[PDB]
Amino acid sequence: YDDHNHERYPPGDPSKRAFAYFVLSGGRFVYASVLRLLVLKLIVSMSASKDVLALASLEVDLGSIEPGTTVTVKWRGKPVFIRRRTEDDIKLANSVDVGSLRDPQEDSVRVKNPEWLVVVGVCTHLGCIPLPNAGDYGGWFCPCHGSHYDISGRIRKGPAPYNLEVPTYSFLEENKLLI
Amino acid sequence: PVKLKAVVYALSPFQQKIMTGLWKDLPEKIHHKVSENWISATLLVTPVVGTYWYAQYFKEQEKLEHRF
Amino acid sequence: FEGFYKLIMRRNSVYVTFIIAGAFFGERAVDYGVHKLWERNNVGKRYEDISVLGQRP
Amino acid sequence: IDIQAAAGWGIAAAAGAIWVVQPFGWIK
Amino acid sequence: TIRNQRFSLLKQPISSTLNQHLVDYPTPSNLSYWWGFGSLAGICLVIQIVTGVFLAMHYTPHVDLAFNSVEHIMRDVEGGWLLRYMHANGASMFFIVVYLHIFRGLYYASYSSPREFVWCLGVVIFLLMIVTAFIGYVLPWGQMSFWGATVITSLASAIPVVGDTIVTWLWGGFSVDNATLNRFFSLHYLLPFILVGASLLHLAALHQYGSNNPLGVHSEMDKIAFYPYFYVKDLVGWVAFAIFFSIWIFYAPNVLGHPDNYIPANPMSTPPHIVPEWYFLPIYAILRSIPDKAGGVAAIALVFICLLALPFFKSMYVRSSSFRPIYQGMFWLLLADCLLLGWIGCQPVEAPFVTIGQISSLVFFLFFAITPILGRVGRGIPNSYTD
Amino acid sequence: TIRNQRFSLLKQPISSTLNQHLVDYPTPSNLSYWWGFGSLAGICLVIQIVTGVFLAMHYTPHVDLAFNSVEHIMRDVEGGWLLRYMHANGASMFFIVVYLHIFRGLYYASYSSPREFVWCLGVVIFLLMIVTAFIGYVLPWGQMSFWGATVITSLASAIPVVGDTIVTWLWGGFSVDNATLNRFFSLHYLLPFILVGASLLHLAALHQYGSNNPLGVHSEMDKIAFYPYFYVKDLVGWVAFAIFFSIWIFYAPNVLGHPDNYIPANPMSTPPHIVPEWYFLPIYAILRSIPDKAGGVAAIALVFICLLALPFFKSMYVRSSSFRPIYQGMFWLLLADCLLLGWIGCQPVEAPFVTIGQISSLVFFLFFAITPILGRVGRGIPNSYTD
Amino acid sequence: ASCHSMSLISYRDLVGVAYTEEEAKAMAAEIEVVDGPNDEGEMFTRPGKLSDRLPEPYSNESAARFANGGAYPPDLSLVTKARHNGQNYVFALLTGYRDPPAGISIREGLHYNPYFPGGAIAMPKMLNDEAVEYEDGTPATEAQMGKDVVSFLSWAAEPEMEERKLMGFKWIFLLSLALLQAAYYRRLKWSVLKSRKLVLDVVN
Amino acid sequence: ASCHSMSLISYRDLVGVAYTEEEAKAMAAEIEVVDGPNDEGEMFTRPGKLS
Ligand SMILES: CCCCCCCCCCCCCCCCCC(=O)O[C@@H](COC(=O)CCCCCCCCCCCCCCC)COP(=O)(O)OC[C@H](O)CO
Ligand code: HEM
Ligand code: HEM
Ligand code: HEM
Ligand code: HEM
Ligand code: HEM
Ligand SMILES: COC1=C(OC)C(=O)C(C/C=C(\C)CC/C=C(\C)CC/C=C(\C)CC/C=C(/C)CCC=C(C)C)=C(C)C1=O
Ligand code: FES
Incomplete structure (x- = not known):
């Protein structure tokens, strides 16, 4: 055998196969790590940018409206619903069986005031904004897939699995509501 | 297909040393590299280095001759 | 000892698991050592080594 | 060679999932 | 023969691959005009790529400029109106041609062995087309664009544990915003090229065995060269398609669209009627027929699962509907059902359309459930219908 | 053999072409590490495409936002600085690996028969690489981007009749402005896919005859399979390239460029030192050397004419510089001359650099002028050097 | 900041680098930022937040030139990356105002600086001893202040x-x-x- | 126009459709368009133009 490039092991010597797996496993560690790093860098570059995450916290104030209408207000990219309900409205909203609801919750829990109903106005199904004064329950209707919300914002018909989310809020004296 | 006649003996990769050959015959390896390639190395290095040094000398002379 | 050393050489699934584990642990160990020596080489220059860190006025 | 191989490759896949995604904190 | 000298330049190594794949490729002599829609779809893809490359010279993927950049393409750049109407209605032409192509494949059972890989690559191509067209429709940044992007990126939330993180990763934030639009632009430039590659693979898989024919029989005894016969037939088809497309471009450029996308995107107000483009409406209907998030997404995935599993059903050895009366009738019922699903997708979600959509979705899945039963039973036809 | 049963999966129709063109393709056993730069070029192309696609998700092609969007990538995108530096330095890496590839071809006369078409495709690929990298450098919209765009788009003004018309058509107006940037961005997404196709055609043309070898002889009697031998040989070069690239990315990210591109574009003022990237420096020196605009453009085009005409010159039958000492010396002189031209391009236009550049361009062209006469003279070597 | 803007930097970028969250919060709250429109359609001002950028000293480039003899003080966000040998160059130009060579006259409004190309700069010398009061107590000498500000600029360009x-x-x-x-x-x-x-x- | 914008239409658009060039020029001159900033750095006003 030519020995300019490689010198043989003495005849009658056991194979170096098991030594060679160990040297090779060594560099395969690094190859796998490099693949993982590059792929994860590419994937995480699509995650939210530092400036996007910067604008993710703030609160605003509000005023007042007529007894029976709603006005949408603004946040991050998300509307917020306000609806001061009447006495017969509360009677309607306090006569629904909790068991029959797919998300059992009473109106009293959701509201911090007997008549002022404040709730994030984004459909829990796929993100559309539910149209007010529409539906089969006098609450809201989401046009996108037919999700019906009652006056308290509880889902009653459609694909949506949750009721409209109540955010943290409070009053100041009578007409200044902090969300 | 070319008609070939030859005898080839080969040894298994797991019966030979893999890396020691890098550092064997090292003086021969250096001597061959230098002796076969010194003309090429000269033909590549001389014009670049000469042109660079001449440009530097030209710039120094031009800078000095514009002073007071 | 011999059990794992016989599984790794005889089943490629075990060898691939061994490669994945080695990548994970080796990359963490180098990240750790590289940060230790970085901390040793930059004593006092850290954000939390600022003496007045916390009193802007 | 069929059930043992399936178990081994499932173990390898689970380990690779734990290695690529590292949710150390989702053990809750 | 010994190739010492040069014969036809077509047989030289410079041109031999093109010659054997496009000029001399053996083709069944009895192919009808329903076999020209593959070339039509390829032409639609090239038209979309050319018009989109030229339109990307003038479009600005920013929420503050995208709508205005479209309007500037329409009003300011010379022939801009033509370039835009051609891209926007060429998407519709692409989908019309591809739908006709798919239903040709369904009628003549072109998915059956040995052409299963052709059908699977076609299904992958259809998925790529859907994604490409949707993210393209987001780019004008009208009301339709914003709200459709909202719901489609929200689809990922159907996954219980990691669904929200996928939605927020797709958005690049907590809402559909400039990051969404910019990433959708890059994807829109990229996906057409992957579509071209997938179409080439589709064609190579088809030339492994050659095209199926209206009789569904072995065709090796009566094949003819693609050039010139099927070239001139496809040319008749190309000119007719050009007349059709020109009618859409010059006289009805906005009939296959909704006026809502001429209103700039308003993240505050969802429009009262919110629908995708017409070529997505059947999938919309199947989605809305399930009164459940995860159920709807799973039905959408099951549509493509059934399309992919179709070629691997143990079937009878007869392909063409021309010799399969029951399967032929079922195919026509499936076509009617698909048209009904498209029409239902355009309707508000209320009575009687919920029941009609549910029944139509059931019929659509019954097609794919019943075809294997038909194959198993019809395997016994030659033993029961004796001469 | 009658292939009734399935043998090795690689020989099945699903992977036969990848087995024959990529796995089992015969390769001369004596190929050196200089033959590993084509694969490096391909990996550089892939790196550029992937990083650019993910960079385009955050870049805005508008004059009021391009610079700021590039800074927003550096600063706000998680992993953004690494995407940018990999892409910017990746471009320099592509040019290094491609220059080494080209000079490997020149030293071993790889352009000679029968592989002339390979060389011509390579030249077309080099042109595409130059256009792609130039228009890409304009996207940041810094000082260097704007003034470099102002010159190369004015090169058409060398044409007497339609030159000004061509300049104003390429600009999209009467100056370098937003229209120029938008059209550059569109061209810059599209050109790399044309580069991918051209590379595929390049590799196919080469595989018609197989690779030349360092001895320059017929190699059929000692060919081996590409996998795994030249796979592992190429992997060594890939890992070394990764180390080199990582050094540039992590420790010297901006030493390959100029600080002037970090200044936002100013059409009023002009940087006193307006240079291109280093990989265009030799071309730019050859253009500046001629004291006439039209003559300069003609010289630039003559460079590529000389490159394209090299394979077709009647020559001697010996290929390798290993057996052509005079051609070997010419090659080393040419390499020194190209390095000199690159250095001269970075020098301001002032003595003594003007004359040095003129002499250097003259020597560059003398290489191509003198190679054919050497071939004609050396055809008589076997008669003259007898036994 | 009296004449140079750093428009690529925001108060949130300093957190975890040189200040705490509260320190940067108070610093931002000490400035006024134009916001709006309100519900009535009128612009207004408000205290700054962490996400706000560093305030600009001038409304536009022309207003900067008019207040500085027609010369525009460039943005310093990338200055160290935007000049050859950037850190060293900025330190040497900041600490390099000295009398011109014999036979060199500087026109009114400019100041001589051999490190500046041409030699005549429109920026006056403003790194002088005790120009700043340091909360940590280190003497605010000219060289100290120049070194510290070049360190800050180096970080700002290459965060x-x-x-x-x-x-x-x-x-x-x-x-x-x-x-x-x-x-x-x-x-x-x-x-x-x-x-x-x-x-x-x-x-x- | 006292309540609705037409932000996509320029005065040049009317030329050759409903007005001569001089007619649209005088029309635009009738309105006050903001412009600047000037050399001193202030926003000012100018007569409207066809563009
Ligand atoms: C989208 C899915 C739809 C779901 C539908 C719900 C379940 C129904 C599934 C059955 C499909 C409904 C349509 C089936 C009837 C098709 C019409 C038909 O076949 O009638 C033929 C009449 O002959 C028949 O086929 C009647 C047979 C009745 C069924 C007998 C079943 C026994 C055979 C079982 C074989 C199973 C496999 C058969 C493969 C074809 C047509 O005769 P002709 O066209 O040759 O000429 C007459 C005409 O006037 C001129 O065109
Ligand atoms: C690489 C090729 C392509 C490029 C560069 C491209 C580019 C663009 C651009 C810039 C727009 C925005 C301008 C506009 O709205 O008119 C757009 C919109 C669109 N593109 Fe594409 N496109 C390409 C291929 C395709 C393909 C293959 C399809 C269909 C599958 C498609 C479908 C659409 C659709 C539906 C729109 C929205 C049209 C509208 O209502 O205005 N594009 N494209
Ligand atoms: C961009 C989209 C597509 C292009 C460019 C394309 C192209 C082609 C072409 C040129 C042919 C051969 C000529 C013809 O039969 O018309 C063909 C055949 C075929 N295609 Fe496609 N196709 C596309 C999409 C699809 C889809 C979505 C499917 C199914 C899901 C599909 C399935 C088939 C089948 C089964 C055949 C074989 C037809 C037969 O032999 O009768 N293709 N395609
Ligand atoms: C995108 C850039 C390019 C890629 C990816 C590329 C790729 C390749 C590959 C993979 C090979 C076969 C393996 C090898 O010897 O390296 C090759 C061979 C070759 N390439 Fe390229 N190439 C490129 C550009 C060029 C250029 C610009 C030229 C010359 C003008 C050129 C001329 C050649 C020649 C002559 C060969 C045959 C070499 C021989 O057999 O010795 N290539 N190329
Ligand atoms: C389809 C593939 C590609 C896409 C989508 C793409 C996209 C981009 C984008 C968005 C930029 C601007 C951001 C930045 O400058 O960092 C850019 C810059 C650039 N690209 Fe590409 N690119 C691609 C391929 C290439 C290729 C193949 C080359 C090399 C020939 C190249 C060379 C450059 C250069 C030189 C710059 C300027 C980098 C700088 O200094 O900032 N790109 N590219
Ligand atoms: C210590 C604080 C300052 C630093 C670190 C600083 C830094 C710099 C730098 C690096 C330049 C650019 C030099 C070049 O072109 O290469 C510059 C230019 C300039 N600076 Fe400042 N500067 C400071 C304070 C000021 C102040 C307070 C003023 C105004 C009173 C000012 C006005 C200018 C002007 C007008 C220029 C343009 C000069 C010219 O083109 O000639 N700078 N400064
Ligand atoms: C038997 O043979 C033949 C057929 O019957 C099976 C055919 O159906 C057709 C007609 C239909 C074809 C070939 C459709 C091809 C469709 C595709 C791949 C869609 C997109 C088309 C592009 C971009 C072509 C891509 C190919 C290349 C090489 C890229 C470079 C080309 C350009 C720059 C334009 C032809 C011509 C044919 O003869
Ligand atoms: S988004 Fe509201 S029901 Fe679908």
Whole structure:
């Protein structure tokens, strides 16, 4: 055998196969790590940018409206619903069986005031904004897939699995509501 | 297909040393590299280095001759 | 000892698991050592080594 | 060679999932 | 023969691959005009790529400029109106041609062995087309664009544990915003090229065995060269398609669209009627027929699962509907059902359309459930219908 | 053999072409590490495409936002600085690996028969690489981007009749402005896919005859399979390239460029030192050397004419510089001359650099002028050097 | 900041680098930022937040030029990356105002600086002893202030330097290990070919 | 126009459709368009133009 490039092991010597797996496993560690790093860098570059995450916290104030209408207000990219309900409205909203609801919750829990109903106005199904004064329950209707919300914002018909989310809020004296 | 006649003996990769050959015959390896390639190395290095040094000398002379 | 050393050489699934584990642990160990020596080489220059860190006025 | 191989490759896949995604904190 | 000298330049190594794949490729002599829609779809893809490359010279993927950049393409750049109407209605032409192509494949059972890989690559191509067209429709940044992007990126939330993180990763934030639009632009430039590659693979898989024919029989005894016969037939088809497309471009450029996308995107107000483009409406209907998030997404995935599993059903050895009366009738019922699903997708979600959509979705899945039963039973036809 | 049963999966129709063109393709056993730069070029192309696609998700092609969007990538995108530096330095890496590839071809006369078409495709690929990298450098919209765009788009003004018309058509107006940037961005997404196709055609043309070898002889009697031998040989070069690239990315990210591109574009003022990237420096020196605009453009085009005409010159039958000492010396002189031209391009236009550049361009062209006469003279070597 | 803007930097960028969250919050709250429109359609001002950028000293470029003799003080966000030898150049120009060489007259409104190209700068010398009061107590000498401000400018231009360096050390060590492995792999695969004995009949 | 914008239409658009060039020029001159900033750095006003 030519020995300019490689010198043989003495005849009658056991194979170096098991030594060679160990040297090779060594560099395969690094190859796998490099693949993982590059792929994860590419994937995480699509995650939210530092400036996007910067604008993710703030609160605003509000005023007042007529007894029976709603006005949408603004946040991050998300509307917020306000609806001061009447006495017969509360009677309607306090006569629904909790068991029959797919998300059992009473109106009293959701509201911090007997008549002022404040709730994030984004459909829990796929993100559309539910149209007010529409539906089969006098609450809201989401046009996108037919999700019906009652006056308290509880889902009653459609694909949506949750009721409209109540955010943290409070009053100041009578007409200044902090969300 | 070319008609070939030859005898080839080969040894298994797991019966030979893999890396020691890098550092064997090292003086021969250096001597061959230098002796076969010194003309090429000269033909590549001389014009670049000469042109660079001449440009530097030209710039120094031009800078000095514009002073007071 | 011999059990794992016989599984790794005889089943490629075990060898691939061994490669994945080695990548994970080796990359963490180098990240750790590289940060230790970085901390040793930059004593006092850290954000939390600022003496007045916390009193802007 | 069929059930043992399936178990081994499932173990390898689970380990690779734990290695690529590292949710150390989702053990809750 | 010994190739010492040069014969036809077509047989030289410079041109031999093109010659054997496009000029001399053996083709069944009895192919009808329903076999020209593959070339039509390829032409639609090239038209979309050319018009989109030229339109990307003038479009600005920013929420503050995208709508205005479209309007500037329409009003300011010379022939801009033509370039835009051609891209926007060429998407519709692409989908019309591809739908006709798919239903040709369904009628003549072109998915059956040995052409299963052709059908699977076609299904992958259809998925790529859907994604490409949707993210393209987001780019004008009208009301339709914003709200459709909202719901489609929200689809990922159907996954219980990691669904929200996928939605927020797709958005690049907590809402559909400039990051969404910019990433959708890059994807829109990229996906057409992957579509071209997938179409080439589709064609190579088809030339492994050659095209199926209206009789569904072995065709090796009566094949003819693609050039010139099927070239001139496809040319008749190309000119007719050009007349059709020109009618859409010059006289009805906005009939296959909704006026809502001429209103700039308003993240505050969802429009009262919110629908995708017409070529997505059947999938919309199947989605809305399930009164459940995860159920709807799973039905959408099951549509493509059934399309992919179709070629691997143990079937009878007869392909063409021309010799399969029951399967032929079922195919026509499936076509009617698909048209009904498209029409239902355009309707508000209320009575009687919920029941009609549910029944139509059931019929659509019954097609794919019943075809294997038909194959198993019809395997016994030659033993029961004796001469 | 009658292939009734399935043998090795690689020989099945699903992977036969990848087995024959990529796995089992015969390769001369004596190929050196200089033959590993084509694969490096391909990996550089892939790196550029992937990083650019993910960079385009955050870049805005508008004059009021391009610079700021590039800074927003550096600063706000998680992993953004690494995407940018990999892409910017990746471009320099592509040019290094491609220059080494080209000079490997020149030293071993790889352009000679029968592989002339390979060389011509390579030249077309080099042109595409130059256009792609130039228009890409304009996207940041810094000082260097704007003034470099102002010159190369004015090169058409060398044409007497339609030159000004061509300049104003390429600009999209009467100056370098937003229209120029938008059209550059569109061209810059599209050109790399044309580069991918051209590379595929390049590799196919080469595989018609197989690779030349360092001895320059017929190699059929000692060919081996590409996998795994030249796979592992190429992997060594890939890992070394990764180390080199990582050094540039992590420790010297901006030493390959100029600080002037970090200044936002100013059409009023002009940087006193307006240079291109280093990989265009030799071309730019050859253009500046001629004291006439039209003559300069003609010289630039003559460079590529000389490159394209090299394979077709009647020559001697010996290929390798290993057996052509005079051609070997010419090659080393040419390499020194190209390095000199690159250095001269970075020098301001002032003595003594003007004359040095003129002499250097003259020597560059003398290489191509003198190679054919050497071939004609050396055809008589076997008669003259007898036994 | 009286005449230079740093428009690529925001108050949130300083957190975890030189100040705490509360310190940067109060610093931002000490400035006024134009916001709006309100519900009535009118612009207004409000205290700054962490996400707000550093305030600009001038409304526009022309207003900057008018207040500085027609010369525009460039944005300093990338100044150290935007000049050759940026850190050293800025330090030397900041600490390099001195009397001009004999035979050199500087027109009114300019000041001589040999490090500045042309030699005549429109920026006056403003790094002077005790120009700043340091909360940590270190003497605010001219060289101290110049060094500190160049350090701040270096960070502002290259805020990713430390993570990037920490990545380059780890990955070059790992890739060098991989290169050793790859060399062993190539040589092991090729040894059967390199050590082979070839027997032929030909001689010459 | 006292309540609705037509932000996509320029005065040049009317030329050759409903007005001569001089007619649209005088029309635009009738309105006050903001412009600047000037050399001193202030926003000012100018007569409207066809563009
Ligand atoms: C989208 C899915 C739809 C779901 C539908 C719900 C379940 C129904 C599934 C059955 C499909 C409904 C349509 C089936 C009837 C098709 C019409 C038909 O076949 O009538 C033929 C009449 O002959 C028949 O086929 C009647 C047979 C009745 C069924 C007998 C079943 C026994 C055979 C079982 C074989 C199973 C496999 C058969 C493969 C074809 C047509 O005769 P002709 O066209 O040759 O000429 C007459 C005409 O006037 C001129 O065109
Ligand atoms: C690489 C090729 C392509 C490029 C560069 C491209 C580019 C663009 C651009 C810039 C727009 C925005 C301008 C506009 O709305 O008119 C757009 C919109 C669109 N593109 Fe594409 N496109 C390409 C291929 C395709 C393909 C293959 C399809 C269909 C599958 C498609 C479908 C659409 C659709 C539906 C729109 C929205 C049209 C509208 O209502 O205005 N594009 N494209
Ligand atoms: C961009 C989209 C597509 C292009 C460019 C394309 C192209 C082609 C072409 C040129 C042919 C051969 C000529 C013809 O039969 O018309 C063909 C055949 C075929 N295609 Fe496609 N196709 C596309 C999409 C699809 C889809 C979505 C499917 C199914 C899901 C599909 C399934 C088939 C089948 C089964 C055949 C074989 C037809 C037969 O032999 O009768 N293709 N395609
Ligand atoms: C995108 C850039 C390019 C890629 C990816 C590329 C790729 C390749 C590959 C993979 C090979 C076969 C393996 C090898 O010897 O390296 C090759 C061979 C070759 N390439 Fe390229 N190439 C490129 C550009 C060029 C250019 C610009 C030229 C010259 C003008 C050129 C001329 C050649 C020649 C002559 C060969 C045959 C070499 C021989 O057999 O010795 N290539 N190329
Ligand atoms: C389809 C593939 C590609 C896409 C989508 C793409 C996209 C981009 C984008 C968005 C930029 C601007 C951001 C930045 O400058 O960092 C850019 C810059 C650049 N690209 Fe590409 N690119 C691609 C391929 C290439 C290729 C193949 C080359 C090399 C020939 C190249 C060379 C450059 C250069 C030199 C710059 C300027 C980098 C700088 O200094 O900032 N790109 N590219
Ligand atoms: C210590 C605080 C300051 C630093 C670190 C600083 C830094 C710089 C730098 C690096 C330049 C650019 C030099 C070049 O072109 O290469 C510059 C230019 C300039 N600076 Fe400042 N500067 C400071 C304070 C000021 C102040 C307070 C003023 C105004 C009173 C000012 C006005 C200018 C002007 C007008 C220029 C343009 C000069 C010219 O083109 O000639 N700077 N400064
Ligand atoms: C038997 O043979 C033949 C057929 O019957 C099976 C055919 O159906 C057709 C007609 C239909 C074809 C070939 C459709 C091809 C469709 C595709 C791949 C869609 C997109 C088309 C592009 C971009 C072509 C891509 C090819 C290349 C090489 C890229 C470079 C080309 C350009 C720059 C335009 C032809 C011509 C044919 O003869
Ligand atoms: S988004 Fe509201 S029901 Fe679908």
